[PDB]
Design a protein around this ligand. Structure first.
Ligand SMILES: CC(=O)N[C@@H]1[C@@H](O)[C@H](O[C@@H]2O[C@H](CO[C@]3(C(=O)O)C[C@H](O)[C@@H](NC(C)=O)[C@H]([C@H](O)[C@H](O)CO)O3)[C@H](O)[C@H](O)[C@H]2O)[C@@H](CO)O[C@H]1O
Ligand SMILES: *[C@@H]1O[C@H](CO)[C@@H](O[C@@H]2O[C@H](CO)[C@@H](O[C@@H]3O[C@H](CO)[C@@H](O)[C@H](O)[C@@H]3O)[C@H](O)[C@H]2NC(C)=O)[C@H](O)[C@H]1NC(C)=O
Ligand SMILES: *[C@@H]1O[C@H](CO)[C@@H](O)[C@H](O)[C@H]1NC(C)=O
Ligand SMILES: *[C@@H]1O[C@H](CO)[C@@H](O)[C@H](O)[C@H]1NC(C)=O
Ligand SMILES: *[C@@H]1O[C@H](CO)[C@@H](O)[C@H](O)[C@H]1NC(C)=O
Lengths: 321, 164, 321, 164, 164, 321
């Protein structure tokens, strides 16, 4: 007649590491490391991301002709660019404070494009029809949809003055451009005034531009340049444009409420109707575990990224059958 | 093992005992069989459950976009950003790796301690009414039926009742 | 005859958490978490902070007329702004590198204001009397106390040239401004010269400014703008101002020894004569414990900020009475 | 308990003993009373005092102004700054929380261990001159006066002096 | 000691035993001498080695240029850079200091545990064929030669072969 | 009749700290803290650093006459400046994005200087002979070796246009300068055009410079200033210079392939033939241990910096002989 004290054993092959010993087989264990993802780009905070398709953010805002068929919502929790987003500023030049603008637009809650300076009534004495082969629509010369290239009507480019008052009850994003001919000849051919200037001002923003006439290497066949500028006009504020030449004028602008603390994801993963608390460029992941090895770059409330391939915690005891 | 029972003087585990982590195997005239000690198993379960949940739930974070973008005249702050990301990555990887190594050791020491404590609880109950074989088994100096085996498992075993 | 082995028990209700068990009652414990503050803004390193009251740093440095009642010591360990600090640049325009300057002034020793270009003797050939409704004192048009508005004397504004040499044995902070009329009409009315310019130079600083005449929205009733510039003049160095118009001249400047590693606190809590090693916008706290949940943004030698509401360490043992 | 004494085979504590963490209760013809073991109490105290001071004093910090100010074209570095502050928050909160949970467990294990060590120290000197009752008590096979009990508490107890 | 052997009921160590961490001292008619237990020593060695390699090698080290240069209009991001470096300094100093303190405690407790486990291993083998003096020593109730002493160290000791 | 159980002891004087007790003597231990260095500047990952001798990086790149070396090495893992690197821009002025350039040049795997615009054939219509006492070699007025001072030939300074195409299959670093006279009189004397400008452009870089004329203190005997600019020209791209004045032209430029992630060490420690994975300004350190107290700012694969003076890990047991 005997009674024995003992402990559980089973067929479990689970192994864990301990400080004294590697590869110890235990009866039960749990994973602390989130090692999988769903291969989709999902909604953050119940809101879908902005998808730009062929276009990057610059192309979308300026209205690059390749961006015509994009469907933009009035809100997004973050922005998705793909390896297919090539269509930017098709007219060569510099986009000023571009990274900043991208950051500040990464999430918005009520976004609308509207016509700030209507094409039909705004410029009776200037030509609005200018295009370029550098910005092509189906193999034909075209231009940005949201801007208008103002050149001289007949022999002259009269001084223009235009103001917009922000009555939208939210911030208004206004973009414009300044054109820089390679030669004094082209300057007169386009704007007639050799002495031309552009001035833009608001309660905050104040800047003056003059044409920089210089020989340059050709980009997309052009020795000319076009620089792009923007500002966020506060509710109630006014923005005023003056030019004797070279202004690429606002046509459409954007009214919005900026969100905060989001960002841009670059991924070819398909966007879907799922919800997640943590988005990765590879796909969405569960946020319940404390650590994840899926990707160093995330957006959300996320497990901490670690280099570990394995973090496994013993719950049960040494399995010795 | 730190407490000397598991893979210790108790050399192996019981696949026969399916209903608990720690328990008893009895043999008498009525038969043999496995029975799990429910109190010590359930306490261990409660304990380990709290440990796992502590490691998981103490991690809380705020909504964050990790990525940042810099132009080719911003290289210095770009590398600052990289130093921050990499620094956080070095800290969390090192700490997480060691936390699991260290706490896994402690969890096994914990199971080992529970087994030892159970053994010595029975040992103190039986006293000289039984002989210690050494593999975690007690051989009774008297007849022990199912009710007797149960009193041992129940912690209610009656010592003066056996002078046999 | 019996002897027993046992352990201490008492009436302690202190509870702590353990990895295996929550809410364990123990006989003795100590707190690792500093969860309270004294509700005051105190001295850091034995020195009181600069208090700006109604004014922000720009208003203080320029001498906004509403800042006359503020008082500056020769040293401070940090700067306090309140939710009531609105009085800034009363003449609209841009304050260049403003955040940097605020940072560089966040702690100073040996601070003194002095008259760099005395109003009475510096400008014999120009009018110094300019004021504006934009900077008003007690119902009357006024101007910055530390700057001087130079306009034409009679029909003429001769070219001015003025230099200052820093003999003060420490850095001199020099502030000035450049005025930008909305119309050429105003340009001639004030500065008489259409071609007017401002030039400022030292061993380090080099710039030439031109007036930018443009239509702008009215801010505080003004379509004009006044931009503000500054430089730290090194000991021994010379600074030279030349202008044919539009210069808002330094009148008072500041000699100082910049400190380092301090900052700016925004709080409405009352300043007192107490001393602390750690200041938070809510109040000062003890710096003895390793952790504090009062506030993440602090100045001093401070416990690390954590989200914890309780960190309590068992000293004594399990309490079992 | 890891070592099986506190809330172990010794089921409860003594509110009667006010002068120490661990100690003795004696019963003889002269009376009863509590006496604290001074060596084991003070050793435990020194240890726990050192633990607490280590946790507190190993934290070294430099004068730091945490806050920074950025204009509306500085959004990226403003968020880099925020990522740093928050990243530090996640790390210290997690580590502090787990440090306290883990070390609280160890402190309680420390106390449990000390009680057991004291018990077995007494047990080994008394040997068979006393009976092991359980709940931490030894019943003597001879007469033990106040002078005799103190020798047990002092660890100087004289075994051969008693055969009965 | 947590397990009560080292600086415990075994008061001191043996400078005489040079070939291992844990072992035996025997005295019989043929002579006296020290012998190390190789199995328990080598196990402890394997373990401590794994602990040390874990602390050292789990540290990720990537090529990094820590320094940054800023002009006199860059003070804010210069101080941000400083906050990052100092912030990493505080974290690593604190964690390393505590990691060494805590794991040193554990390493000593480990050795203490190994000594105790070995002692109880011999004791269960000898049973009542020997007397426990204390100080870690067993006095045989029979004659034990070098071949017999080797059986104890080998764990092969034969109980029924010795009565008396 | 006796067998005893015991543990090892020895003559070891090693002590460790434990959470419960300070200064515990143990039989064996290992050090986790790297507290020593070799007092030298070594090769990093088998490549020597760039040594600049009398000059700093600006002086070396511009060709300050005191920087005459055997040659710039063809590759380096990092850069060393000493307390003897004093010879910078000898013509006073600002070096734009200087810190950025230093970072981006901190390691390269191939570097060659070449003559981009040969002095003899490049400028038939301008004077190339300009020198200054501010940049002197052996007691005589001289100039930067890598730049050329273009002034008016006779009474005239015609518009110059000059282009370089990068056929080097790697980046070309092009440096140039813009001169700033104190007076219009000097402007006309050198440049004759008062309206003068400089334009530099490539497919990426586009910028225009005009002289800023201002009265300034003398630095190295000059009230004039000279600003320095650079760009990294991509393989295949073209850079084009146009100027009506004030251009200090590229003479020599540098073809290079950047590595990444290195930096600058400021030390007077001699460079030696030793090799290291971690360089400190005090000396090289061993990379095997996890922590080091030598220096917070390092280059390499380095142990984490800590303030600890001792981190020692018990391996053996309590030593009680
Ligand atoms: C104005 C024009 O038609 N000029 C012709 C020459 O440019 C042409 O030589 C080629 O010109 C190309 C530029 O053509 C465009 C363009 O970008 O596609 C034509 C656009 O209509 C014109 N847009 C406007 C509003 O005027 C545009 C514009 O002038 C520039 O973009 C402004 O900088 O120019 C291109 O540069 C080739 O590299 C060049 O060889 C010949 C052939 O016809 O003569 C002119 O007709
Ligand atoms: C290269 O660097 C050295 C310094 O390391 C320059 O040499 C001399 O530098 C000193 C400054 O420490 C100059 O001092 C000046 O001396 C004159 C009188 O000699 C005095 O009037 C000035 O106020 C100032 O103290 C000194 O001029 C200078 N030597 C020369 C010959 O100019 C050297 O100029 C540098 N060379 C280049 C090409 O950068
Ligand atoms: C600041 O002072 C100006 C006059 O200089 C005054 O108009 C304004 O009301 C003051 N600030 C606030 C918040 O009222
Ligand atoms: C911080 O508070 C007081 C300062 O008056 C100090 O005596 C105390 O020791 C500190 N807190 C703790 C828990 O030690
Ligand atoms: C680094 O190299 C080896 C490996 O750590 C070591 O033996 C040597 O002493 C170290 N060098 C110095 C100078 O400490």
């Amino acid at each position: 007649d005997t009674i024995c004290i003992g402990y559980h054993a089973n067929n479990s092959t689970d192994t864990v590491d301990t400080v004294l010993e590697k590869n110890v087989t235990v009866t039960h264990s749990v994973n602390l490391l989130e090692d999988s993802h769903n291969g989709k780009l999902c909604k953050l905070k119940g809101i879908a991301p902005l998808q730009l398709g062929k276009c990057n953010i610059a192309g979308w805002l300026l209205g690059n002709p390749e961006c015509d068929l994009l469907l933009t919502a009035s809100s997004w929790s973050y922005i998705v660019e793909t390896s297919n987003s090539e269509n930017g500023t098709c007219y060569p030049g510099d986009f000023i404070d571009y990274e900043e603008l991208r950051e500040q637009l990464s999430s918005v809650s009520s976004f609308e494009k509207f016509e700030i300076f209507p094409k039909t009534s705004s410029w009776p004495n200037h030509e609005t029809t200018g295009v370029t082969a550098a910005c092509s629509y189906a193999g034909a010369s075209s231009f940005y949809r949201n801007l208008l290239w103002l050149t001289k009507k007949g022999s002259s480019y009269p001084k223009l003055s235009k103001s917009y008052v922000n009555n939208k009850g939210k911030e208004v994003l206004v973009l414009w451009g300044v054109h820089h001919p390679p030669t004094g000849t082209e300057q007169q051919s386009l704007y007639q005034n050799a002495d031309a200037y552009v001035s833009v001002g608001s309660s905050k923003y104040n800047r003056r531009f003059t044409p920089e006439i210089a020989a340059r290497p050709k980009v997309r066949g052009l020795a000319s340049r076009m620089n792009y500028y923007w500002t966020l006009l506060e509710p109630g504020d006014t923005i005023t444009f003056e030019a004797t030449g070279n202004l690429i004028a606002p046509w459409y602008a954007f009214a919005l409420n900026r969100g905060s603390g989001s960002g841009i994801i670059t991924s070819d993963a398909p966007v879907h109707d799922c919800n997640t608390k943590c988005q990765t460029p590879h796909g969405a992941i569960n946020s319940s575990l404390p650590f994840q090895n899926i990707h160093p770059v995330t957006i959300g409330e996320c497990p901490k990224y670690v280099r570990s391939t394995k973090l496994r915690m013993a719950t049960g005891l040494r399995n010795i059958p | 093992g730190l407490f000397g029972a598991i893979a210790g003087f108790i050399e192996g585990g019981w696949t026969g005992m399916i209903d608990g982590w720690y328990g008893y195997h009895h043999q008498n005239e009525q038969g043999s069989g496995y029975a799990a000690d429910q109190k010590s198993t359930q306490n261990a379960i409660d304990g380990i459950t709290n440990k796992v949940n502590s490691v998981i739930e103490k991690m809380n974070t705020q909504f964050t976009a990790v990525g940042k973008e810099f132009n080719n005249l911003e290289r210095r702050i770009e590398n600052l950003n990289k130093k921050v990301d990499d620094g956080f990555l070095d800290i969390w990887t090192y700490n997480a790796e060691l936390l699991v190594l260290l706490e896994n050791e402690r969890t096994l020491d914990f199971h080992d301690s529970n087994v030892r404590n159970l053994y010595e609880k029975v040992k103190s109950q039986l006293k000289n009414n039984a002989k210690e074989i050494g593999n975690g088994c007690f051989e009774f100096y008297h007849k022990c039926d199912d009710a007797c085996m149960e009193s041992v498992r129940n912690g209610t075993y009656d010592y003066p009742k056996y002078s046999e």
